[PDB]
Amino acid sequence: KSEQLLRIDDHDFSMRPGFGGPAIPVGVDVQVESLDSISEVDMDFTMTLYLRHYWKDERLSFPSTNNLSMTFDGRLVKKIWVPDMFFVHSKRSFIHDTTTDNVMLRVQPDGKVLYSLRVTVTAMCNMDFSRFPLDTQTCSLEIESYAYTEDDLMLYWKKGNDSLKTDERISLSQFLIQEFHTTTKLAFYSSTGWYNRLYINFTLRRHIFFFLLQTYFPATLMVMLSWVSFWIDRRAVPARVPLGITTVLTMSTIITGVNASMPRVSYIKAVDIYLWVSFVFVFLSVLEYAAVNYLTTVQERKEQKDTHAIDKYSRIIFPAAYILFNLIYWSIFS
Amino acid sequence: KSEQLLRIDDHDFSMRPGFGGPAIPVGVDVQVESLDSISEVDMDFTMTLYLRHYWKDERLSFPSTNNLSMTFDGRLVKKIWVPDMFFVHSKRSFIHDTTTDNVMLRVQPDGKVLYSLRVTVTAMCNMDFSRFPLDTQTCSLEIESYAYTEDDLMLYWKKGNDSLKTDERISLSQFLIQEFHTTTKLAFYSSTGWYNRLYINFTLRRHIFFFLLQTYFPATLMVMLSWVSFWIDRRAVPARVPLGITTVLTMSTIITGVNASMPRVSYIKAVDIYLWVSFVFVFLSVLEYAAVNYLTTVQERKEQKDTHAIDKYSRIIFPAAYILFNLIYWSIFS
Amino acid sequence: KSEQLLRIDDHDFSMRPGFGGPAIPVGVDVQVESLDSISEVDMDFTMTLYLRHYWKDERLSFPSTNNLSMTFDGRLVKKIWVPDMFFVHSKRSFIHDTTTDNVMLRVQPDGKVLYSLRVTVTAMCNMDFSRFPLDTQTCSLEIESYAYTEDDLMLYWKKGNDSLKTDERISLSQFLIQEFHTTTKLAFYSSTGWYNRLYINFTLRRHIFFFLLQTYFPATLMVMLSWVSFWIDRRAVPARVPLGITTVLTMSTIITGVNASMPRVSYIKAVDIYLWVSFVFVFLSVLEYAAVNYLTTVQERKEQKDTHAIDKYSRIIFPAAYILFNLIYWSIFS
Amino acid sequence: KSEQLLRIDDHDFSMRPGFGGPAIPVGVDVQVESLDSISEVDMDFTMTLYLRHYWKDERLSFPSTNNLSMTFDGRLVKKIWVPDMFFVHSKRSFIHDTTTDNVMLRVQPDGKVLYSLRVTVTAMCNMDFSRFPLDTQTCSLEIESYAYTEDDLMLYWKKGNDSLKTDERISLSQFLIQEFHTTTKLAFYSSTGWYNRLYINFTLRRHIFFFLLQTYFPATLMVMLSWVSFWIDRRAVPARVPLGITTVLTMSTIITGVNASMPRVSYIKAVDIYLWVSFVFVFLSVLEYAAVNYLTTVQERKEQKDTHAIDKYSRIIFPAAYILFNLIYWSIFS
Amino acid sequence: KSEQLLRIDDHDFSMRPGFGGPAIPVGVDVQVESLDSISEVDMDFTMTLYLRHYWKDERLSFPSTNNLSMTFDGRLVKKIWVPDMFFVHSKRSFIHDTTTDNVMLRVQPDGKVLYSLRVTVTAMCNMDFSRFPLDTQTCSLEIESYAYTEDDLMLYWKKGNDSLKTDERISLSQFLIQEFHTTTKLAFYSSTGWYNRLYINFTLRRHIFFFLLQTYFPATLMVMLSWVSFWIDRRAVPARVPLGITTVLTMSTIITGVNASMPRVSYIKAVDIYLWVSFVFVFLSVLEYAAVNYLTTVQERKEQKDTHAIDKYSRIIFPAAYILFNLIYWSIFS
Numbered sequence A, B, C, D, E: 001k002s003e004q005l006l007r008i009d010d011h012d013f014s015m016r017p018g019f020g021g022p023a024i025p026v027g028v029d030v031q032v033e034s035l036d037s038i039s040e041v042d043m044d045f046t047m048t049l050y051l052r053h054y055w056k057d058e059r060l061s062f063p064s065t066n067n068l069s070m071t072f073d074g075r076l077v078k079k080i081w082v083p084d085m086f087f088v089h090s091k092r093s094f095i096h097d098t099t100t101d102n103v104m105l106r107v108q109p110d111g112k113v114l115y116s117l118r119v120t121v122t123a124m125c126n127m128d129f130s131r132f133p134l135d136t137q138t139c140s141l142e143i144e145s146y147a148y149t150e151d152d153l154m155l156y157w158k159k160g161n162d163s164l165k166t167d168e169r170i171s172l173s174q175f176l177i178q179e180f181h182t183t184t185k186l187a188f189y190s191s192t193g194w195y196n197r198l199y200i201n202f203t204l205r206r207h208i209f210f211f212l213l214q215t216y217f218p219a220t221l222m223v224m225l226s227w228v229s230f231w232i233d234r235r236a237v238p239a240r241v242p243l244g245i246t247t248v249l250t251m252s253t254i255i256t257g258v259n260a261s262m263p264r265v266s267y268i269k270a271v272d273i274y275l276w277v278s279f280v281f282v283f284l285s286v287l288e289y290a291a292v293n294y295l296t297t298v299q300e301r302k303e304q305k306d307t308h309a310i311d312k313y314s315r316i317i318f319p320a321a322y323i324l325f326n327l328i329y330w331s332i333f334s
Ligand SMILES: CCCCCCCCCCCC
Pocket: A268, A273, A276, A277, A280, B209
């Protein structure tokens, strides 16, 4: 029996190696397999990875006439001591178990141990959509011991920045992923003490040109089209009025569609500001012709009893104001 | 063996400490980690937290030459007595178990015990949307013993208002969170008796300006635009009619979009009242020109065989009525 | 040991109390905690409640110098006999298990037993939407023994109509709940025999005014607006034609939006009938002016080589027909 | 002890009754309780039913002074032999377990056994939507032994067509259910051999009138309305042009709404063909007036330097072509 | 007892057959039952299949007077050694367990073993939608040993390309499936070594004509309709202006609907390019008439104090440019 070579019943495996003395160091390596999904409304992401641990335990040393190691499955875990790692700020996770539990244990003749498992985790990530669609987001995954303070267990990256590997075909449907790196920091709990915590960081970005073409282009085109009325004869009322009222209707339908396609985030964003400023511009264009028509009718009635100056001034004033607004807007939001 | 220092087999752990005598006090502390989501249609919220208990049991005292404590995992729970807490008015919950069960047990040499676990819970919360989007909501989470009356188990906050801690980056996508505090109250069951119950309370609010700009602005702009027709010559029927009919169409499309974006709550809200009053105003504007045109045609036919008074009165009457309505509406709903 | 006071190993708990003789009566009480959700497409509802049982078993009597009872958790259930209740016509259910199983057992010194558990269940409910939104629905939850006929187990409400309690803040987002009561009836299975079955009944209703304002109002307003054209001069073709064609477009957009907001039920309802009758009315209004214009052009051409009678008759005929239709419709559907 | 009357430890229950000899027959009966849901996109359905088995095993015979049978729960299943049935072409299933496992076992004194359980299953069903909404679908549920060939286990319906029962109130929200019946057929696996397979069949249909009124009616009405322009004076260009352009807009909005309400199936259906033919008809109507106006302007200019024949021919040609198309279409698709 | 014929307790089943010597070969066969679903947003697919293994183990040989084999259920798996296969790049999987675990074991008298199970798996698949809807996708499923390198376990297809079978009625709602085949490749892990990996490949395609008719047809028809204005008299301003403004509105509504029906992929696709080029064409058509009207008004005013050349040139220039664009576009994207 392979389990009789290790004196399982001759040791108490309820206690850590080296109990009573200096803390036992544990090394960690991580391989990211894929990103599964992201949720903007719930502000969280899902990931699948391999987790590996390294430490030494003299109690597991066995005699040998060569240098071959023994491999075990997950059934041996319950008979020995292993680190109790958990993910911080996580919402749900589980360990794969098809066709059997995805757990492996390797023991060297001198007592070195390797412990590996395959897991999926969902973690929180606070997001800010003030500068949408030009916004940038940063995420992290956290690992910590649940019951062991730094005085008993010392947690670190096995090989520094080289302990993190990522799959070559990791990608997201609506985001670009960049700048993976790792960090460490100490955490304090008033109940027990200080703990070591490991981090994995990365950054997310959007495709700008797609959003530009979908949103900014039609509004600008509609604003430019609203200016055509300034060059039509003021005596053609049945041409002048329905032009403006149909332009307002088109702008309203565009805004409603754009709202219907965006993530349901209930606070002001930059695109909304741009759209509503364009709406206000379209509205003022109709007000202008209203004034011009009333003034012309009053003058004709008074005379009874050429280009109007308002149109001549508007032809210059409206484009200049729109250009100034664009310049300020793109200086603020880059 | 660490478990041989505690006389597990020398005691009956089916019975509470102090059985037959005064009730055993139990203290509680809670740390909120994050809010996960909220559902307005189902009226419930989800939360993740740490739960901690404190009590004393002489049966667990062990001799020691120092003052060091022993730490245990979840496997020891089934061999001893622990409080049976549960969440009241909850829909679902579970305990995290990756990479192993998130449970810890600490025993002092004098028999003091600390019991901590990490859990996610979904709880009900009745909501009222009468004053939407200006409404405010209050929520609470409840904790109670399942089988032990106050005569056997006394439940309380360990440190009063200081027993509650919240994460510094707790936030919701579409809500603002404020005013966390704790309370206690007694509950009565006719089957068994009286029980102690603990509460955790907080308040929710919306972003007003976003809803204002999305909903109230376009309706007001359309109502103001409908008034332009009063200043156009009454002899331009092909300009007067299509203006009004297109304004009605635009208002209808706006209302349909606004309905399509709101949570599916099937009873009257304030925003609906505002929108339909604006719709009625637009409708009356078309009726006005209908009357004016019929009267003018009748007068011309009678004569055959200047500004009309109706327009002159409407130019003043319509804005005043709209202002009065706004004043009453914003006095009622603040 | 508390379990040594009951002679567990001295009895066979695979057989019911009183085996071989008259059936053992069992009493039931239910407390409804909340309604969780409802699904109109799948026609089912979800509920959370406490379930309690009462019976007597002499085998569990224990000697005592006082009149105190013993309390047990769910671990004792597997060592004794308990009733095997199940929910009929249910889709899914489960028992809460945080922080431990929500089960309690109380034994009196004379052998009386109380057995309580907390459960969530989803049950079917056939619905008929013919009279939507004026429809009414009735639901029920059913409880029955799985393996025991009335000759072995007699099931009844412990205290008649007083065995049912409901929470004071039970509510649904889109429904009103009323008229809770209980009933019993016998059921027959050809495989085994007759069984007792318990019922819990309640009724559901909608908010009428919300649906009225959302649906019936705009259609009526559009039908009334379509009548304006009868009072405009027949010589203004460019005003008469686009009015009607835009009214048809507005009505079509309204119908499409109303369809987009309703539950996806694929058979005819009353609201659809009302909407399509209004659509037909709008369509006939355009046909009327088409005829009037053709007749006027023919007469002018013949003469070449005042109010038309059709308009004068239509002004009276259309409103009367619409009023008659409304009267019949609201007499049929109340 | 009831389990001591059956010599459990005196027999090997790892082997089928009659091992080494002729195959043991097993009879099956099924009672359908309800249909839970259907998914057109994923093409599958869900069902809840009772499953019952019948066979004889001499090893379970026990002496008795009467003819009473013994009833067992699911805990005895693991101690004896039972058939290993499974559902073929299924996606997921489970056995109900509230308040305990829904399993029953009945043993006669001569060794006859009845084995019943309550289960929910989701199964695949390939669907074809070519003739939607006039299409018809056929479904089936399949049952088979997992490890036993016909040489060891013979599976059949206990009572032929009478072994299938259905609930009197089984219904689906958007479908009609009819023609339940059962069949059997042999299946071959190259790995092991031949197996018996049982079938349960039924048929599904839609409500035709609802779809007719929702889809076909508005398109026909719009096509008929487009013909009005043929009877208006050709000199009223501002009435003729906007009529046609608004009719095209209305038709486009109707088609978009109809697409938005239908199941997301990405291949051509009959309703789409009808809608796009109507669209083409509307488009040709505008082209006609374009030609008429250009020809009239050319003739007036040439003369400078009555009803047009095109309108007279169109008034007859368009309705005849539409009627012919309808006749062919409804002859093809019935 | 059947398990006493195999000397279970006389062997250590924690170690592979042939331990210490050459690697043990294992053969694999797969039968695909159905495809369950696909997700374009999450880029993954689901499948159900049977998995079978073949190998030889002398430790399981038993004496026999004939050549009959013994069949076992899943309860024997835990008492012997079996290969630890797992799926690479998978998101979730599970083994069916109704009415019991779907596992079978067959042992020949000489020690040959067959091991079969039924499983459902969801796997990742990176997709590229640049050429949508004309795009093509390739997918694969991967199988590998979790703890055994090629030096200990040799994995291969049992019968080459004949080891893969597919159901005759496998289909997807919105895709066509073709070209199933298998491949093998070696993989390297720096932690342990080299591993054998098996592949299953297939290809996906769309229905082109459906997308053509739904998307490309209406845009082309609207572009062609916008050209009608070039043939109308330039003196009919109230006919010329609203035509163009309504054509722009119709095009915008079409684009919004098309966007509302497509999978939410946030980057540029070919269909978007086609739609926005058509939009630009419609916009230029309105600009043309604006210029023509201004020039005519200026000339009339100057004279005060026939066909215009712009229309004559446009009638030829616009269709030629559109044809050239179509030719280039369909040469690029085939
Ligand atoms: C809530 C933070 C300030 C947001 C400012 C938005 C201003 C937009 C006004 C648009 C007017 C048309």
